[PDB]
């Protein structure tokens, strides 16, 4: 049996696209 | 025409980088891809349509750091061979990055260098950014320092240091490490400013209420601090400084330049409802001891010249009001035979915010940059510790044996013995 | 494409903006596809939204306030330890105040009617019925899910149960209150709520 | 990018090596048959560290086993995950070293090991530069500790700056399997002193400690000790795998821990260790962790550290977490233990964080740590050897096959020295 | 005549094309047989194509954006190995940009309606169904198979599974990724797409 | 009208030739049959109402690589009797192509080339595509221009030459069939280009990212440079130079005629995104020592002549800043008697991709064509093999049994020596 | 037992009719 794997990377956690300052 | 080429060498040095590149995309109003919908020109070179591409390279001996940067969200902004990458880590051995894993990279490392320096001459400096602790943050920060000297010779070279905290190391090869580097950054770097981790750390607790920063949260406030000190040459401003002033105005003899920073306010969303941010409010605790981002104390040391940098919308009589006020209080310690204390500087943009960052709004903001005799705390420390560790030859075979000469150990060691001379004999 | 692309809420709002740009355009200088920014989006239709007198409330009555899902789970413990705090704060901010500041919207992830009901009459904010679709869309947009069950496409949850998200009015993420996640501020990420900067708009 | 070239020497080391590809296979996930299965980048992105693409899409491992006998190499082929490896990697020995060191490094070992470098060679050169090797065996056994360690010797003079990690199971202090093993272990240690880059130190009765009194098993059989070994084994190596904020090679682990070149014996351990019972009670948090971390309950070597001082010791967090915790915690045990830590080394520790945990467990910390505290068991086999070599106790199962007198001397002397060596910096 | 001339997609192409020749002629000084480029075919017809949540989008829809073809198979390991990256790819594309640039329209060789439902669900991105006789025809047109099991006429294979092709308006094949071919840059090949002069026209 | 006739004898001939004539197809807009649905006339013969034929010749003494152009889709390009194939092979023997298998196809090819040439006056010059490695393409190479020399002594002629690598070689008698036929490509031809396959193999490498490129990767990019050579003669241009002024500007002396080449931008799909491609930057790319096509690395040598031939968006007076820079830079070496160093063109319609090919979009190129000291070691590496299987007669037996005489080869080699002490005299 | 061929040859898998330049 395997199981999903449920971790995500400091990386992207962090740097999500956020909406641009002009 | 007028720009400056960021290095980001290390691990340190690349995820510091992150935070910089990523405010500085937000400041301008660019996308991840490169494409907004001369200001901006300092930082980002034209090319084609609308399109704007980094002037930075990122160099590590790490493949396990550069390539989310080649694979995330953020793989078309930055030109490909900007990133460079070897097979094997330094493995936290100054002797592996300055010998054996050094040449492989640093030729590659200079072409795009240069590649990226020879558009439009005139360029304002280097900024390089590393962790002190690290092999190849320490290893290659001496080689590459080395190659753009006797390169460039006419040239302002900025050096970011995340320097090792008093009591919290993560390493046991530090003292080794430390004192090796600041071998080779006292005759290659121009100004270097110290950044410890544990001073934002506490920072952190105090001023923002997280007790669970990582290495993220670190990062924002390193990228805020260096948003802030490029601010004038970016934008428009009543009286703007830009890198090259700063050796006329911080650094009185060749040897002292070494730079404290300090960045107020730092405030959330519970506190900026609270405050009014006063110029007079901000200067305030930009000088208070405790708020400094490099855990050594300036009480018992002496302001050998002092730099400001205003952001927001800041009028210049509040300026002078706010700094006499610094003056005249005799807490702090100015040197007798340097009376203008001070340089004032006002840029007008405001601080930008990453949005669901861990810092809100402001209206106006300071980042200090101090040159002190308190100095000589933070370097007779970690030449205490140095003398621990080589009273009989611990971790030093992983140096010797891999491809220095023993007595390299003991040439940085009165250097370092030099230097607290320097910093005694200063402040009499 | 905010704030993930994989999304029901963003495939539903690319269909309906780029036909209307194609619609435009056969009836004319047309860039095509449109902006993401030039896209515009519905949220919530006109009868996903209920007070706790269950009388329908529009899209439109939700502007100038502050408005925040709230995934949550009847038998979670972690729900059932974090909803006080959050009713003390819904009081202590929109009580003493000449203004309404805050609102929250109910996301259930319980399993059936019944159990969505008596969870639900505990809550004096709004919520969306379970049967309605929109808790699935939503679900899958914010990425709010207990176990894996639900096919990510190659990304992560977000988080887990529960969850309190400050959204705005194109259905992105403005900030987002660890209550159990990266930061882990259990009880305390209320405090980080900026209800000024945060305008449903 | 780096590679590892795994090698299992014994029936010890190939039941403690099939473990490991058992939990390093889910880790990556991977079926039995050899294919991917569960859609993340995540999980494949560094898997050139332990697999060989075969361009139809499958992975195989770089494994080696070793074996004098045709029986127990059998068993790891035919159980479920056998069918992983590729059939030719498996070298066969016909005859078998009948549990003798001699037999297994001087006469039966030396017709077979240079077929066992004919196929370590393919695979360690293969690639475009090599980071290093993994072996596990046993120092009782025949096979594992006697060809085990000539394999040693053989690949370092090959490969002199690239790195080789041993994960040695030592002989139990108080009842003993295999009535020869302090020959084994003394003879074994000798020239493992001087060719060994990195050597990791499991005792089967930590083991059996740990699986009674934490984990408070029923009947722990070498399935659930293996298990032990494999997360622990897999911890060193969550690095390499996977990105983190704080990295930490194979390598950088050598640098902050062994102060001098004699000295690389090394004491594992693991944590969280709780019961199935007492799983959803307990608290996860940094500060738990650390705790579990170091106790002599929870050490993986049955020889009490609170008797020496830690020389350098390294933890390799593994989870999503923050680096201040993982920062202060570290400097809580230096400044509440001030006793068990050596005093010329300002901050003894070492911090990694790794950023995907174990599977299942939201944090995670496996510990690796260089202690004079390991000088009880290298002082207790030598007393055992010492009671034997003086009345020429079964020497002449070593004496008989080229293995003469002052070679068992020459191993006395050179491991009573280390025993003294490490009282030195008691 | 792009890229073979013998194709079942080719054919009623120029069944249609010299129907309409003939009819227009015979209505009222004209070339006949009409010209490869004068020809006109609408590719996939009105209801063909679905999206992640099965529901049909009309051909008109993917003009301005760079559309590819991913011929795949659930059980084969390339297909398994292959899936995150064009996964991750799509999203670092699309996200991060102006506009949406990139669309993957999957083609399926699967054993059965269930096996290609069970791949089909972790697809983002659009999908032909596998009982239309469209799919068989762009088999044909394109000419892969993952062994000789279907006749083609004098030619070879042009690749296998997995394959992907950035195509154009007329059917054409825009340019080929090198992933199982001779230039075997598989995984790799992904990077070579040119996003700039193969917009859907 | 005025016209250029190609020729490609062997195979490394005809497979780059088979690349040059899609290029040129696509370039001009014809068919696979030649018929568009007074420029192209310098390459295309008219034949009746808008059908064209190319004025090219193919020579193969194997049918296998010419049969299979009559077999392929360009089976109508091509006039039937223009494809020439023999019976046997010349099998990697000089001897053979030149002494016995040669007469037999000569005399064939010669009356078919001068029923090409006789058309029209006004007649440019030669383009022959051959391997000097080989047997076809060194002895019916010589056998070929034997004929030309007698009878059109005074009309220029030019040869593209496959000149083997130190590393890459695919054949063992190749250092012999090199002096042999160098010994008569220095009577026989103005202009000899030389290139070398394991160059073109780094540039695939560094610029492509090709870990694996075919023949025909490197035969299309062949093809680039033939097509940027001869745009002057064939497309309107802003300042434009022809084959009948290049002999005069790039050949100093009778014998130094061996000439290097560069081409600039080699950008794919990935980088044409992010790089504006600048005068100034592609010119400093042509001239940087890995872009070299023959693997001799231009530091040890001093310049003689460049020709740089722009090719698309460019403007003069960016041009002659561009090469100015390069003039004072000291480490590209300039020879003492030669001021007039560089001789540029300006073309304007940029090259043509061939699509779904492996180069992107560009909206300006540089092929630059260089004549230097630096190709002595060349001539003295093929020197030094030469002399080890010579020392004691390996292979000279398959040579010497077919119709030359032992005492050809030490003639030879004092050619290949005098050659060699040329260009140490002229470095000078 | 004929099993069939399933190999490309070089000029025809490459040199086909590319699509014209205006």
Redesign the interface.
Known sequence: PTLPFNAQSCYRSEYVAKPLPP | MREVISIHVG?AGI?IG?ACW?LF???H???????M?DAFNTFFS???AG?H?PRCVFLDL????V??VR??????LF??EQLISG???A???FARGHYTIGKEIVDLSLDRIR?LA??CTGLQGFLMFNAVGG?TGSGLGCLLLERLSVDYGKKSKLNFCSWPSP?????????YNSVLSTHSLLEHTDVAVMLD??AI?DI?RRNL????????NLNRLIAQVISSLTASLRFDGALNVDVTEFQTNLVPYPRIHFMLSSYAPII???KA?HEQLSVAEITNSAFEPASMMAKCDPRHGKYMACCLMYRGDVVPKDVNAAVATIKTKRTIQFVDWCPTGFKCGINYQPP??????DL??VMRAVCMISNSTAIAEVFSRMDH?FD??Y??R??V??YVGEGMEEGEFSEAREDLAALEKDYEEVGI | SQPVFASPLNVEKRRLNEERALMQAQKANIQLPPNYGDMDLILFPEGSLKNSNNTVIPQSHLKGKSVALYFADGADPKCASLLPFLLNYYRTMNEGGANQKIEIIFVSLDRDREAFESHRAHMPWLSIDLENPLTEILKRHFRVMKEYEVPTYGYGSRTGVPSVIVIGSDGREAQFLPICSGLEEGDRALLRWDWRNTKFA | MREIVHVQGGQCGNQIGAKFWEVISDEHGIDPTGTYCGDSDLQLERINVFYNEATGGRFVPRAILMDLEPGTMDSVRAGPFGQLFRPDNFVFGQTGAGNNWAKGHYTEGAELIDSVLDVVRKEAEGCDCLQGFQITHSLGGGTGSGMGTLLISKVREEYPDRIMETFSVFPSPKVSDTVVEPYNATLSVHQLVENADEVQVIDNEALYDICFRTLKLTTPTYGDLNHLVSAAMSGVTCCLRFPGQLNSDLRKLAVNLIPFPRLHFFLIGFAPLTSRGSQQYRALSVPELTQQMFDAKNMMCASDPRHGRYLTASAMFRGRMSTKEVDEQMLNVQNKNSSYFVEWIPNNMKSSVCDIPPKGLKMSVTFVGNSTAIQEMFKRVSDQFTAMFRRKAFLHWYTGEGMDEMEFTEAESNMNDLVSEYQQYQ
Request: with cysteine.
């Open positions: 691990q995820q992150n990523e995309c937000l400041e109003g660019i996308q991840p891809d490169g494409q919908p034209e090319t084609g399109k591409v790490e493949p396990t750091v390539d989310e694979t995330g969200t953020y793989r078309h030109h490909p097979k094997e880590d493995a936290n051995n590649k020879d558009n092999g009591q919290v190391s993560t390493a046991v090869v530090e003292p981790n544990e750390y952190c209420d997280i007790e669970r920063p990582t290495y993220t959330s969303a519970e409802y930008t915010v990453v949005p669901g960052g809100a709004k510790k621990l560790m009273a009989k611990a971790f075979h992983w």
